Design a protein around this ligand. Structure first.
Ligand code: MN
Length: 362
C-alpha cells in the first residue's frame, strides 16, 4: 500500500530573481502517502561565485533523509573540494565537471559514514537533477531518473538522459557487480541505476564507488549560454516526465508563459496537469527563465479567456446530473480545438471543475 484515498493537492511554491534569471517552483505530494522530494534553488553562490546560480530537484525513495541532506549540502560539497577549486581564479570547465563528480562521490561517502556512526535506520536514496549556471555556461547535472531540459529558440536544445538499470552500460556495471536487471529493476527491486544513498546496493567488495550495483556518479554536460536564444530550463522528477514528454512539456510551458509571467502559477499548472493525466507520484518542478523567455502575449491572453468562456458554456449545457468524470468524458469526445499544446484537456480541468462546482456544489 501507500496511496491516499484522495490526492493531496497542496502546493509548496517558491520564486526568486537575480543574475538575469527568474524562477518559480512547485512541489505537490499528490496520491502518495508520503512526500519524499526536495529541491535547491539559489541565485548567487558563496566564495566568489555570486554571479552563479544553482537549481536542483531530488526525488527521494525509501525515505526523505537522503534527498533532504542533498538539497541542503550538495552544493557546498561540489564547490568546496579541490577539484572544483583548481585552478587560478575562475574554475575551468574541467574543474566544474570534475568538481561536481567529486562532490557527488564525497557527499555519498559522507552520508554513509554519518549513517554508520549514528546507526541510521533509514535505507533511503535519492536522484538528483540540476543546473549550475555561470555567466557563460549552463552545466546540466544528472544522477538518476529525474530529468532536466533547456529550451532555446522555441525548441528542446538539450535534455538529460535518464539513468535506468536496463540501459546497456548500466546493465553492464550491475552484472559485473554480481547483480542482475530483472525487467527494469536491479535485482527486481530498484528502478534506478544511479542515486545518492541506497547504501545496501553499494557494498560490493572488489569494486570502486562507481562500480557498485547503484552508482552515485553524475553525468555533467556543459552548454555555452546564448543570451539571445536561451529561453528557459525545466527540472522535474519522473512524477512529471512519466506523463509528459520533452517536447510536449516544452510546448505546454511556452503556451503558459504566453499567458502569465507568474512562474509559480506556471509550475502549479504543470503539476496539476500531470496529476490530471494520471500521475500518481509526488511531483516537483522548477522553471528557470532567462531574459529572452517567451513574454506574455495580449492575443494569447484573449484566446485563453475565450477558451475558458467556451468551456464554461459547454459545461453549462452538458449539465443541461452527470458527475465531473462524465462531463470530462463528454468534453473529450467533442474534440475541442485550441486546447493548450501538450497539456490538452487535462490542462483545462481546473477551469472545468471550477464551473462544474459552481453548478453542482453538493
Ligand atoms: Mn518519483
Amino acid at each position: 500500500g501507500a496511496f491516499l484515498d484522495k490526492p493531496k493537492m497542496e502546493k509548496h511554491n517558491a520564486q526568486g530573481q537575480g543574475n538575469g534569471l527568474r524562477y518559480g517552483l512547485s512541489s505537490m505530494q499528490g496520491w502518495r502517502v508520503e512526500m519524499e522530494k526536495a529541491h535547491t534553488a539559489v541565485i548567487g553562490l558563496p566564495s566568489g561565485l555570486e554571479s552563479w546560480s544553482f537549481f536542483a530537484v531530488y526525488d527521494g525513495h525509501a525515505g526523505s533523509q537522503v534527498a533532504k541532506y542533498c538539497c541542503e549540502h550538495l552544493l557546498d560539497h561540489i564547490t568546496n573540494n579541490q577539484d572544483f577549486k583548481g585552478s587560478a581564479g575562475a574554475p575551468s570547465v574541467e574543474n566544474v565537471k570534475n568538481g561536481i563528480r567529486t562532490g557527488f562521490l564525497e557527499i555519498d561517502e559522507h552520508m554513509r559514514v554519518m549513517s554508520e556512526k549514528k546507526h541510521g535506520a533509514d535505507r533511503s536514496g535519492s536522484t538528483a537533477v540540476g543546473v549550475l549556471i555561470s555567466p557563460q555556461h549552463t552545466y546540466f547535472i544528472n544522477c538518476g531518473d529525474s530529468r532536466g531540459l533547456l529550451c532555446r529558440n522555441r525548441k528542446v536544445h538539450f535534455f538529460t538522459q535518464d539513468h535506468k538499470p536496463s540501459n546497456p552500460l548500466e546493465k553492464e556495471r550491475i552484472q559485473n557487480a554480481g547483480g542482475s536487471v530483472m525487467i527494469q529493476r536491479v535485482n527486481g527491486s530498484l528502478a534506478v541505476s544511479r542515486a545518492l544513498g541506497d547504501f545496501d546496493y553499494k557494498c560490493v567488495h572488489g569494486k570502486g564507488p562507481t562500480e557498485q550495483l547503484v552508482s552515485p556518479e553524475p553525468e555533467v554536460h556543459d552548454i555555452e549560454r546564448s543570451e539571445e536564444d536561451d529561453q528557459f530550463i525545466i527540472l522535474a522528477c519522473d512524477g512529471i516526465w512519466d506523463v509528459m514528454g520533452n517536447e510536449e512539456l516544452c510546448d505546454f510551458v511556452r503556451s503558459r508563459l504566453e499567458v502569465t509571467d507568474d512562474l509559480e502559477k506556471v509550475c502549479n499548472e504543470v503539476v496539476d496537469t500531470c496529476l490530471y493525466k494520471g500521475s500518481r507520484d509526488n511531483m516537483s518542478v522548477i522553471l528557470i527563465c532567462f531574459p529572452n523567455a517567451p513574454k506574455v502575449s495580449p492575443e494569447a491572453v484573449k484566446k485563453e479567456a475565450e477558451l475558458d468562456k467556451y468551456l464554461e458554456c459547454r459545461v453549462e449545457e452538458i449539465i443541461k446530473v452527470p458527475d465531473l468524470v462524465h462531463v470530462m468524458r463528454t468534453l473529450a469526445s467533442e474534440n475541442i480545438p485550441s486546447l493548450p499544446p501538450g497539456g490538452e484537456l487535462a490542462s483545462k480541468r481546473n477551469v472545468i471543475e471550477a464551473v462544474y462546482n459552481r453548478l453542482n456544489p453538493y
